Design an enzyme around this catalytic site. Structure first.
Site, PDB file in Angstrom:
ATOM      1  N   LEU A   1       0.808  -1.212   0.000  1.00 43.95           N
ATOM      2  CA  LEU A   1       0.000   0.000   0.000  1.00 43.95           C
ATOM      3  C   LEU A   1       0.843   1.264   0.000  1.00 43.95           C
ATOM      4  CD1 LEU A   1      -2.861  -0.958   2.500  1.00 43.95           C
ATOM      5  CD2 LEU A   1      -2.869  -1.079   0.003  1.00 43.95           C
ATOM      6  N   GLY A   2       1.832   1.351   0.880  1.00 43.09           N
ATOM      7  CA  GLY A   2       2.686   2.521   0.919  1.00 43.09           C
ATOM      8  C   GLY A   2       3.713   2.389   2.019  1.00 43.09           C
ATOM      9  N   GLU A   3       4.529   3.431   2.146  1.00 43.55           N
ATOM     10  CA  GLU A   3       5.567   3.483   3.166  1.00 43.55           C
ATOM     11  C   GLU A   3       5.555   4.861   3.805  1.00 43.55           C
ATOM     12  OE1 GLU A   3       8.413   4.803   4.195  1.00 43.55           O
ATOM     13  OE2 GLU A   3       9.568   3.215   5.163  1.00 43.55           O
TER      14      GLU A   3
ATOM     15  N   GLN B   1       7.149   7.591   7.020  1.00 44.39           N
ATOM     16  CA  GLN B   1       8.448   7.948   7.581  1.00 44.39           C
ATOM     17  C   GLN B   1       8.798   7.141   8.823  1.00 44.39           C
ATOM     18  OE1 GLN B   1       6.510  11.151   6.610  1.00 44.39           O
ATOM     19  NE2 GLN B   1       4.936  10.017   7.745  1.00 44.39           N
TER      20      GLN B   1
ATOM     21  N   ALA C   1       6.925   3.986   9.583  1.00 44.39           N
ATOM     22  CA  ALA C   1       6.511   2.601   9.413  1.00 44.39           C
ATOM     23  C   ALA C   1       6.119   2.379   7.960  1.00 44.39           C
ATOM     24  CB  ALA C   1       5.350   2.248  10.346  1.00 44.39           C
TER      25      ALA C   1
ATOM     26  N   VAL D   1       3.320   0.285   5.463  1.00 50.68           N
ATOM     27  CA  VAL D   1       1.953  -0.218   5.509  1.00 50.68           C
ATOM     28  C   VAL D   1       1.706  -1.062   4.270  1.00 50.68           C
ATOM     29  CG1 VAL D   1      -0.485   0.372   5.701  1.00 50.68           C
ATOM     30  CG2 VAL D   1       1.244   1.846   6.747  1.00 50.68           C
TER      31      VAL D   1
ATOM     32  N   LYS E   1       0.751  -2.247   9.605  1.00 48.13           N
ATOM     33  CA  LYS E   1       1.691  -1.146   9.747  1.00 48.13           C
ATOM     34  C   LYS E   1       2.917  -1.672  10.482  1.00 48.13           C
ATOM     35  CE  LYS E   1       1.014   3.822  10.429  1.00 48.13           C
ATOM     36  NZ  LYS E   1       0.282   4.844  11.226  1.00 48.13           N
TER      37      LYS E   1
ATOM     38  N   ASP F   1      -3.719  15.896  14.720  1.00 46.73           N
ATOM     39  CA  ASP F   1      -3.200  15.730  13.367  1.00 46.73           C
ATOM     40  C   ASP F   1      -4.339  15.638  12.366  1.00 46.73           C
ATOM     41  OD1 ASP F   1      -0.921  15.724  11.746  1.00 46.73           O
ATOM     42  OD2 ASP F   1      -0.969  13.541  11.533  1.00 46.73           O
TER      43      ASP F   1
HETATM   44  C1  LIG Z   1      -4.860   2.683   9.293  1.00 47.32           C
HETATM   45  C2  LIG Z   1      -3.801   2.685   8.197  1.00 47.32           C
HETATM   46  C3  LIG Z   1      -2.660   1.728   8.524  1.00 47.32           C
HETATM   47  C4  LIG Z   1      -4.408   2.378   6.832  1.00 47.32           C
HETATM   48  C5  LIG Z   1      -5.579   1.679   6.572  1.00 47.32           C
HETATM   49  N1  LIG Z   1      -5.740   1.638   5.259  1.00 47.32           N
HETATM   50  N2  LIG Z   1      -4.672   2.311   4.642  1.00 47.32           N
HETATM   51  C6  LIG Z   1      -4.430   2.515   3.319  1.00 47.32           C
HETATM   52  N3  LIG Z   1      -5.367   1.988   2.335  1.00 47.32           N
HETATM   53  C7  LIG Z   1      -5.606   2.519   0.991  1.00 47.32           C
HETATM   54  C8  LIG Z   1      -5.410   4.025   0.753  1.00 47.32           C
HETATM   55  C9  LIG Z   1      -4.710   4.401  -0.385  1.00 47.32           C
HETATM   56  C10 LIG Z   1      -4.492   5.740  -0.675  1.00 47.32           C
HETATM   57  C11 LIG Z   1      -4.981   6.717   0.174  1.00 47.32           C
HETATM   58  C12 LIG Z   1      -5.684   6.350   1.309  1.00 47.32           C
HETATM   59  C13 LIG Z   1      -5.904   5.012   1.602  1.00 47.32           C
HETATM   60 BR1  LIG Z   1      -6.902   4.595   3.210  1.00 47.32          BR
HETATM   61  C14 LIG Z   1      -3.281   3.220   2.962  1.00 47.32           C
HETATM   62  C15 LIG Z   1      -2.443   3.684   3.981  1.00 47.32           C
HETATM   63  N4  LIG Z   1      -1.239   4.439   3.653  1.00 47.32           N
HETATM   64  C16 LIG Z   1      -0.045   4.347   4.477  1.00 47.32           C
HETATM   65  C17 LIG Z   1       1.184   4.363   3.574  1.00 47.32           C
HETATM   66  O1  LIG Z   1       2.296   3.959   4.321  1.00 47.32           O
HETATM   67  C18 LIG Z   1       0.059   5.508   5.472  1.00 47.32           C
HETATM   68  O2  LIG Z   1      -0.054   5.014   6.777  1.00 47.32           O
HETATM   69  C19 LIG Z   1      -1.037   6.545   5.231  1.00 47.32           C
HETATM   70  O3  LIG Z   1      -2.084   6.281   6.120  1.00 47.32           O
HETATM   71  N5  LIG Z   1      -2.751   3.448   5.250  1.00 47.32           N
HETATM   72  C20 LIG Z   1      -3.873   2.755   5.566  1.00 47.32           C
END
Ligand SMILES: CC(C)c1cnn2c(NCc3ccccc3Br)cc(N[C@@H](CO)[C@H](O)CO)nc12
Lengths: 286, 65, 275
Positions: A9-11, A13, A15, A17, A26, A113
């Site tokens: 999903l992403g990274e 600063q 952790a 995810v 995470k 935040d």
């Molecule tokens: C609770 C948290 C762990 C969580 C739950 N879902 N999710 C998603 N899902 C899909 C999505 C795609 C794009 C824009 C919003 C979203 Br929602 C991305 C994400 N991005 C991580 C990247 O490292 C960061 O923590 C930013 O929150 N974090 C989370």
């Protein structure tokens, strides 16, 4: 474990995810204090509009935090040119955000935040406050906080003047900014520094005096500005109805004590009046 | 369809806590440290501290494990 | 808040018999795993309890001498961490001297009492090599402690309930003209309660009220009217039973003896050196 990685999903600063089979995982100072903050707060809270820590575990320093997987966030919705935000959609987003914030404040927690990217949306249109890595418990006397919290575009003027102690207003003002970003589809007060943020605030909404903010001069980083008349709120938000202007004015009151709380905002006529908030099922999909 | 506000129904297992707005007029705030002008400018009052103290004192007082 | 906290849901127990069962289960499980891995060197559960009490006193002294001044909420959180950890773990598997330092470290992190790791280990009154090795042990046991706490880090102490009760007495109980004369003795009783297992058996509000009423009874101001009118007759009876049981728990507490602690310390060191 039961959690087998499925997709990336992403990274961030602090952790990384990724989506695990559906949940989101995470990942000499020891364990990161941001992760500890999120764990210690999300274990003590349970609300439909607050992100839930389903499970937690890890090895050595690295900790796996299990959250419900969220489809999108409010920032993507706002920035989506194709998507159209009707007043019903705006009311629904505002209502879910405020219900989550009301629950959070009843348990004496400041999010600190609040921004559209930190408001996540699931496939069922339920909005949840996420990213509690900056959240803190409020209400304790003689316990100084930090004034650098909140992204600058959403930081409240008391924070920008160096408020060490504050309450729900720091969230509430951010909420107002989000509401403005929902109405204009563009960030409301996009400052470049603290002084530029204060200048934009005092230009758009007029500079405040002791009549609107009795003890503003006691803030340690208080800076005297030139007097701006401030654009009338109806000129900034032309399509907004009178009740919405009342809500915005309450959210953007310079006096943080006078600033409307989440409960007070939820009781405003804006949410009671027609049209009603859109059900989560019919909310726009980015 | 139209929204209607409902207060959060969370059982506390203890005595009822007076509302924050009534703390000053009920005499509670005369037994708490007064908020300095700096704190008031920040938006923090002695009412919040008193309300938190009372809420914690009354929380779960009648609860049996 | 406590009324929907993890402490109330998972870390408050019906009776000390369930606590003794959990501690005996921990002792038996460690004995089984040690005898399977491949004796009179073992420690009985009552010996483990004596050692745990001694090292809880050690943790209290460590937090009371800590610089910068550690807030009492941090100390309460650390002591609760120690109690919860040694409910389900044996002092023979994890040494209490290290686990108590890990508890203080994790509590400092959780209670937002920002202290740097070198300045945390500078309080450990040892040689710099001793402080560094203790830091490595603490960092290796931090995740173990968090896991054994089941990731339930927020601990509700009775200090803020105590403050709320004192404010309420000052506001609504003119019968007690000056509720501040009760602070010293009620705090002493709160400490004595903290010595026992009451923190795992009663709510923090009940503990604070019991301390306040014990101080009142000691000074002679019986103030049952505060419970009867200011605060269901069955509810009053249950409250009184809870306070009476907690006072009995304080009455029957036995501090560890010097010779007993010495013998158990050698036995524990023998257990850790072997296996
Ligand atoms: C609770 C948290 C762990 C969580 C739950 N879902 N999710 C998603 N899902 C899909 C999505 C795609 C794009 C824009 C919003 C979203 Br929602 C991305 C994400 N991005 C991580 C990247 O490292 C960061 O923590 C930013 O929150 N974090 C989370």
């Amino acid at each position: 474990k039961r959690y087998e990685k499925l997709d990336f999903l992403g990274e961030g600063q602090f952790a990384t995810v990724y989506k695990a089979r559906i949940v989101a995982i995470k990942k000499k100072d020891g364990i990161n204090r941001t992760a500890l903050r999120e764990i210690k707060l999300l274990q003590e809270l349970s609300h439909p509009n607050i992100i839930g820590l389903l499970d937690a575990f890890g090895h050595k320093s690295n900790i796996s935090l299990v959250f419900d997987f969220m489809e999108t966030d409010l920032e993507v919705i706002i920035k989506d040119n194709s998507l159209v935000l009707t007043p019903s959609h705006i009311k629904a987003y505002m209502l879910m955000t405020l219900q989550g914030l009301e629950y959070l404040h009843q348990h004496w927690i400041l999010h600190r935040d609040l921004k559209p990217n930190n408001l996540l949306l699931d496939e069922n249109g339920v909005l949840k406050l996420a990213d509690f890595g900056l959240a803190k418990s409020f209400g304790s006397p003689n316990r100084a906080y930090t004034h650098q919290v909140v992204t600058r575009w959403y930081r409240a003027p008391e924070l920008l003047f160096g408020a060490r102690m504050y309450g729900v207003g720091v969230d509430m003002w951010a909420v107002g900014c989000i509401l403005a970003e929902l109405l204009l589809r563009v960030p409301f007060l996009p400052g470049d520094s603290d002084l530029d943020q204060l200048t934009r605030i005092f230009e758009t909404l007029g500079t405040p005096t002791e009549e609107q903010w009795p003890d503003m001069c006691s803030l340690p980083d208080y800076v005297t500005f030139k007097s701006f008349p401030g654009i009338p709120l109806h000129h900034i938000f032309s399509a907004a109805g009178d009740d919405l202007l009342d809500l915005i004015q309450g959210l953007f009151l310079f006096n943080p004590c006078a600033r409307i709380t989440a409960t007070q905002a939820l009781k405003m006529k804006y949410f009671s009046n027609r049209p009603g908030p859109t059900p989560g099922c019919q909310l726009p999909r980015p | 369809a139209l929204y209607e506000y409902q207060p959060l129904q969370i059982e506390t297992y203890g005595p009822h806590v007076p509302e924050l707005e009534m703390l000053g007029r009920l005499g509670y705030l005369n037994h708490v440290r007064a908020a300095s002008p700096q704190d008031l400018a920040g938006g923090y009052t002695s009412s919040l501290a008193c309300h938190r103290a009372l809420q914690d004192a009354f929380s779960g007082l009648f609860w049996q494990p | 808040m406590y009324h929907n906290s993890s402490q109330k849901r998972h870390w408050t127990f019906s009776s000390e018999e369930q606590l003794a069962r959990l501690r005996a289960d921990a002792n038996r499980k460690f004995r089984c795993k040690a005898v399977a891995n491949g004796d009179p060197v073992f420690l009985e559960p009552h010996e483990e309890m004596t050692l745990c009490k001694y090292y809880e006193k050690r943790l209290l002294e460590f937090c009371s001498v800590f610089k910068p001044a550690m807030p009492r909420s941090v100390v309460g959180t650390a002591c609760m961490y120690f109690k919860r950890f040694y409910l389900n773990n044996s002092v023979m598997e994890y040494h209490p001297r290290i686990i108590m330092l890990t508890c203080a470290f994790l509590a400092c992190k959780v209670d937002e009492f920002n202290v740097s790791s070198p300045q945390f280990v500078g309080n450990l009154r040892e040689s710099p090599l001793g402080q560094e090795k203790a830091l490595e042990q603490i960092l290796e046991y931090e995740l173990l402690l968090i896991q054994q706490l089941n990731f339930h880090l927020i601990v509700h102490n009775p200090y803020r309930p105590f403050e709320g009760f004192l404010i309420d007495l000052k506001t609504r109980y003119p019968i007690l003209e000056n509720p501040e004369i009760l602070r010293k003795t009620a705090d002493d009783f709160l400490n004595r309660i903290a010595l026992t297992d009451a923190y795992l058996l009663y709510t923090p509000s009940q503990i604070a009220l019991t301390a306040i009423l014990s101080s009142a009874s000691r000074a002679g101001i019986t103030m049952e009217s505060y419970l009867s009118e200011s605060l269901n007759r069955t509810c009053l009876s249950q409250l009184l039973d809870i306070m009476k049981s907690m006072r009995n728990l304080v009455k029957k507490y036995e501090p560890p003896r010097s010779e007993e602690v010495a013998v158990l310390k050698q036995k524990l060191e023998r257990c850790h050196s072997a296996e």
